[PDB]
Amino acid sequence: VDYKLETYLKIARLYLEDDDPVQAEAYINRASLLQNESTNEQLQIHYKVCYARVLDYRRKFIEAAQRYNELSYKTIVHESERLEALKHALHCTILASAGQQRSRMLATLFKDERCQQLAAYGILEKMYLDRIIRGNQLQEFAAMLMPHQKATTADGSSILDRAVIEHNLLSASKLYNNITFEELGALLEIPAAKAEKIASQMITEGRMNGFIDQIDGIVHFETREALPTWDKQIQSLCFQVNNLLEKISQTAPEWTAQAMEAQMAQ
Amino acid sequence: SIDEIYKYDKKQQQEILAAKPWTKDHHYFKYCKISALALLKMVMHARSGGNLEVMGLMLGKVDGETMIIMDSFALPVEGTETRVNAQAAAYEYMAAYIENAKQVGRLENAIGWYHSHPGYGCWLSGIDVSTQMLNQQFQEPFVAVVIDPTRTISAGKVNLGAFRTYPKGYKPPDEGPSEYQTIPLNKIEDFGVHCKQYYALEVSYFKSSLDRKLLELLWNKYWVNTLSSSSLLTNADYTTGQVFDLSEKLEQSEAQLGRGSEDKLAKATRDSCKTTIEAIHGLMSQVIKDKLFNQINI
Amino acid sequence: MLIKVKTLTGKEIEIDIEPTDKVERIKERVEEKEGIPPQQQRLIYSGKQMNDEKTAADYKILGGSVLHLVLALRGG
Amino acid sequence: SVSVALHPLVILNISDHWIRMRSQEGRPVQVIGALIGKQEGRNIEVMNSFELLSHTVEEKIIIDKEYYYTKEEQFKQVFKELEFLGWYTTGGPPDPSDIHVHKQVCEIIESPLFLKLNPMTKHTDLPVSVFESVIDIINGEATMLFAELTYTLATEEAERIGVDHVARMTNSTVA
Ligand SMILES: CC(C)n1nc(C(F)F)cc1C(=O)Nc1ccc([C@H]2[C@@H](O)CCCc3cncn32)c(-c2ccccc2)c1
Numbered sequence: 001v002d003y004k005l006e007t008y009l010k011i012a013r014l015y016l017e018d019d020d021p022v023q024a025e026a027y028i029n030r031a032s033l034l035q036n037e038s039t040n041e042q043l044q045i046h047y048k049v050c051y052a053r054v055l056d057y058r059r060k061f062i063e064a065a066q067r068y069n070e071l072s073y074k075t076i077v078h079e080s081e082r083l084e085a086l087k088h089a090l091h092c093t094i095l096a097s098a099g100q101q102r103s104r105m106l107a108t109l110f111k112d113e114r115c116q117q118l119a120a121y122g123i124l125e126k127m128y129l130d131r132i133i134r135g136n137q138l139q140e141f142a143a144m145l146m147p148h149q150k151a152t153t154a155d156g157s158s159i160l161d162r163a164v165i166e167h168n169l170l171s172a173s174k175l176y177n178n179i180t181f182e183e184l185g186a187l188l189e190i191p192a193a194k195a196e197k198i199a200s201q202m203i204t205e206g207r208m209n210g211f212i213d214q215i216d217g218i219v220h221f222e223t224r225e226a227l228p229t230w231d232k233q234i235q236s237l238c239f240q241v242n243n244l245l246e247k248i249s250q251t252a253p254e255w256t257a258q259a260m261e262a263q264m265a266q
Numbered sequence: 267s268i269d270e271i272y273k274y275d276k277k278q279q280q281e282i283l284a285a286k287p288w289t290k291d292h293h294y295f296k297y298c299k300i301s302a303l304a305l306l307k308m309v310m311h312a313r314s315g316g317n318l319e320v321m322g323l324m325l326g327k328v329d330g331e332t333m334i335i336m337d338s339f340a341l342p343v344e345g346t347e348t349r350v351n352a353q354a355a356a357y358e359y360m361a362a363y364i365e366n367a368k369q370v371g372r373l374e375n376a377i378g379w380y381h382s383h384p385g386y387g388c389w390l391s392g393i394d395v396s397t398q399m400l401n402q403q404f405q406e407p408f409v410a411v412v413i414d415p416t417r418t419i420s421a422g423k424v425n426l427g428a429f430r431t432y433p434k435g436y437k438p439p440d441e442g443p444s445e446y447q448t449i450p451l452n453k454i455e456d457f458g459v460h461c462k463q464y465y466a467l468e469v470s471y472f473k474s475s476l477d478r479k480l481l482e483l484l485w486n487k488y489w490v491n492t493l494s495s496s497s498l499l500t501n502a503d504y505t506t507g508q509v510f511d512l513s514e515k516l517e518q519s520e521a522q523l524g525r526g527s528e529d530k531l532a533k534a535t536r537d538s539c540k541t542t543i544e545a546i547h548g549l550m551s552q553v554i555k556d557k558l559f560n561q562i563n564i
Numbered sequence: 565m566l567i568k569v570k571t572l573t574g575k576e577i578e579i580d581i582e583p584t585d586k587v588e589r590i591k592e593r594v595e596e597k598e599g600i601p602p603q604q605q606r607l608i609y610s611g612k613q614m615n616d617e618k619t620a621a622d623y624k625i626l627g628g629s630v631l632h633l634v635l636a637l638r639g640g
Numbered sequence: 641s642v643s644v645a646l647h648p649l650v651i652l653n654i655s656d657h658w659i660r661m662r663s664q665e666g667r668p669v670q671v672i673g674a675l676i677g678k679q680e681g682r683n684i685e686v687m688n689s690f691e692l693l694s695h696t697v698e699e700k701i702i703i704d705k706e707y708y709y710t711k712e713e714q715f716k717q718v719f720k721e722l723e724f725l726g727w728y729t730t731g732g733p734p735d736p737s738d739i740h741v742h743k744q745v746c747e748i749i750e751s752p753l754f755l756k757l758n759p760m761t762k763h764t765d766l767p768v769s770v771f772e773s774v775i776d777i778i779n780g781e782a783t784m785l786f787a788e789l790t791y792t793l794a795t796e797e798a799e800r801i802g803v804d805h806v807a808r809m810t811n812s813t814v815a
């Protein structure tokens with residue numbers, strides 16, 4: 001049973017991954033129901049890999065990333081293969097559609113330490129921390145990416161590039177009070193008209209807050225009223241005072257105890 | 267010890283319940299004690315209700331002449347001041363929550379009900395009086411608690427009132443202090459009609475030793491929010507509503523002056539004084555903050 | 565058969581009922597025992613409000629149970 | 641690394657739970673409970689907290705998932721916009737029992753928090769500590785440990801007034 005399963009899986013994966021994936025996914029889906037569910041003897045370290053690869057090839061990225069991350073923690077599989085699985089998980093998470101599960105996956109990948117030595121760690125850090133991803137980093141990621149994963153719409157605006165542009169706009173929302181169309185276009189490396197159209201669409205759909213003054217060609221983000229800003233800055237100053245006092249009392253304990261004792265008397 | 271009050275005596279509670287002394291008297295319950303956690307939960311729930319009304323339930327016990335409250339739990343009702351109790355959703359929720367809390371260690375039983383009157387004082391309306399009358403007629407004891415989450419923010423002190431009604435047909439003999447409470451025009455008739463059918467217990471708060479230690483440790487970091495409050499911005503719709511109500515009351519007072527309960531001008535003056543004093547307090551807080559922080563030019 | 569009945573406040577009533585009695589019958593039994601009219605009354609079993617009419621044994625008499633009782637105010 | 645905002649209601653809940661259990665059982669005993677809050681981006685805020693039911697067999701603690709699910713339904717009935725965040729316990733530094741209970745809780749949410757309150761303390765600062773789970777490889781072995789987070793006390797007007805009134809508990813107005 002196990003030998004037949006291994007032979008069929010190997011031959012099918014080779015000749016069927018040879019660029020007719022529809023029959024491969026159909027056969028896997030049909031046979032998976034009655035596979036075994038309990039086989040043991042290292043047979044569990046190939047079914048999960050094949051399942052994750054199929055899920056990646058069927059344009060569903062977040063669940064494939066979850067499977068790769070789960071596989072990355074297995075003690076039996078070698079260090080190099082675990083690192084490859086983690087790299088695939090990072091790529092799939094980056095390429096996945098935006099969502100709550102994607103945000104938690106990004107948080108988990110950032111919390112992971114082994115990602116630090118990966119080639120996409122910079123992009124992971126920028127995506128998680130809401131920074132601006134530059135064109136050169138995007139080009140490097142595209143070069144590193146496999147040809148299959150580059151899903152592009154026929155009219156243009158490849159999915160990854162559109163997601164990066166929207167992320168750049170949303171991250172610039174956190175950095176500017178108001179920005180003109182020319183400077184936004186220079187920041188996003190797109191024409192000013194396209195920048196205006198994308199910003200207006202994002203504002204209409206509710207993803208980001210702001211309003212566009214077309215006569216001046218300026219997009220306005222949040223206002224940060226003066227009195228609430230005053231409240232926030234007063235809170236920050238008092239927090240600084242508290243932290244400084246804690247640092248003082250954690251360095252010269254006897255001196256600060258003596259000073260506190262004399263504080264009541266004086 | 268201070269934690270002694272936290273000890274629940276099943277035998278003593280059963281003996282007190284089976285030897286009910288509140289039947290012979292009518293003003294038997296005169297003191298109402300509330301734990302710190304119960305008060306905080308009540309206040310936060312009433313505040314998070316917003317402008318609408320919310321209502322929950324209260325779990326406690328009785329010690330002789332006083333009524334002690336240990337916990338409070340909200341019940342959904344979808345809030346929104348529905349007609350009354352529930353489409354049976356809350357009816358199931360009360361029993362479900364009490365049963366679930368029984369198997370954890372919350373072994374106390376219900377003692378009353380609380381609800382919010384956001385912006386129009388702390389009193390029992392006609393429906394509230396009927397509800398409390400019905401509850402006391404069958405399940406005893408029971409106390410009503412009314413909170414004002416908006417006036418709490420506006421005045422800087424909690425607006426909490428614990429009440430208990432009188433049996434049907436009983437006429438209480440005078441003894442009416444009747445301290446002044448500002449009440450809008452659209453809710454004054456109910457307060458006037460239903461005012462002698464209930465009395466207000468004297469409410470006090472208590473806390474445990476660990477609670478006291480934790481609060482005195484927490485103040486060392488919580489002193490910032492007092493100095494960064496800015497109460498003049500969080501309460502503006504309330505002040506606008508107060509000014510509208512005051513203008514209507516002034517119009518009624520002028521109509522009474524032109525015509526031929528008593529001296530509505532005095533009541534309007536008291537309302538205006540309260541609103542203006544609150545506004546000036548809010549302004550002088552900001553003046554103090556500016557003097558402290560904006561003038562210490564390096 | 566006999567089934568202590570407990571309310572939210574904590575009062576328990578020792579009441580005598582028959583296995584063949586219906587929910588309305590238990591309601592009027594409670595009415596005679598305590599005094600609550602049989603419209604300001606809601607019995608809840610195992611976190612479930614009984615649809616009156618539905619007899620009782622079905623639900624599940626199982627002897628000494630404790631049907632949870634909560635008051636109501638009809639309309640007013 | 642996520643910014644954490646605490647609420648004094650959670651601390652009051654934990655302290656009352658511990659005091660109640662100690663008074664009921666005659667001797668101090670540790671308690672296990674759950675937290676509730678909202679996560680916005682990387683900003684985690686805790687608002688309320690209920691208690692969980694647990695059992696001990698041999699030397700291991702197991703949480704009743706059925707009771708947890710019933711309580712989850714009950715609290716979703718009332719607080720519609722609030723969600724599960726983590727668990728809280730009373731004690732000192734984290735222990736292998738705490739690591740086991742965290743592993744158990746991790747089957748419910750992705751990255752639950754962990755709050756620890758110390759009733760018996762001698763320091764000057766608040767004994768509340770917040771941890772999060774981090775999985776690492778040490779000497780070729782996979783172990784999940786704790787990482788401490790820095791929390792700030794959240795601001796709310798009603799909470800501030802209530803806390804100040806409770807702390808103070810004491811003939812003009814300007815006064
Ligand atoms: C203890 C509770 C559950 N209860 N027990 C019994 C009794 F039948 F047993 C009866 C009840 C019970 O829900 N009463 C009640 C009555 C009226 C209101 C509303 C009602 O007028 C609508 C306008 C607002 C209002 C201002 N003042 C009372 N209300 C509420 C209520 C209060 C806050 C939120 C939701 C509902 C509850």
Ligand SMILES: [Zn+2]
Pocket residue numbers: 381382383389390391394
């Ligand atoms: Zn009311």
